[model samples]
Target: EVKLGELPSWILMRDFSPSGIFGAFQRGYYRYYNKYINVKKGSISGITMVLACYVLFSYSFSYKHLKHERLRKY
Candidate 1:
């Protein structure tokens, strides 16, 4: 058996608790995206919201340009 003597001292000082980070983001996003209530918990919501917003914002912004170049059904 072997042990790395706990994480590293430098890493320990960083505020990187998954639960707290996710919970904080969820609380903030809750006010906006109510539909994702189920996902608005812990890291689940983090992943969902990030991907959803990314796709939505990107597609929406690009849609305008795509219309003049080719036919986009989205």
Candidate 2:
């Protein structure tokens, strides 16, 4: 009911609704990820994407630790 503003306050304020911040990302991911089309493509891309992201995130956080871990831990 508060669509009177130029900003997306209406959409952003729906924190609990489906189109809200949380549910929006949740359903948005599943709407394509869980779809029946191209199961192989979905499975491969989803898993590979997650794995690659995890490795990159871990490496970014431990870049310094990794540099010293092997040199000192031994």
Candidate 3:
């Protein structure tokens, strides 16, 4: 519906055909098929969980036994 330069709006983005009315569907398909921006935030969360588990497992031997000792309440 818009006019730009020597071409019409439908002809701007390869959405037009050699025939005028025959290209209408092409323009509609073009508008509906546009891609959206991707937001990838889950990958970092997985790495954080792994590091936390590693730290907990490696340090558990030193302090974990303190809770069950004879002089535990200190």
Index of the highest-TM-score prediction: 2
Query: Per-residue lDDT for 3-65 in model 1, tens only?
Result: 545657745664567986898688678855555444435356746777898999999999988
Q: Candidate 3's C-alpha lDDT? A: 0.56
Superior candidate under TM-score, 1 versus 3? 1
Candidates sorted by TM-score, descending order? Answer: 2, 1, 3
lDDT of 2 by residue, 15-48 (tens): 7755566776887678656663347644566667
- The lDDT of model 2 is 0.69
List where candidate 1 sits over 4 angstroms from the true fold: 1-27, 30-46, 72-74
Q: Which residue pairs overlap in candidate 1's backbone?
A: none
Instruction: Give me candidate 1's TM-score against the actual structure.
Output: 0.33
Candidate 1 C-alpha error for residue 34, in Å: 13
Report each candidate's C-alpha RMSD, comma-separated, in the order given. Answer: 13.5, 7.4, 21.1
lDDT (C-alpha, whole model) for all candidates = 0.69, 0.69, 0.56
TM-score of 2: 0.40
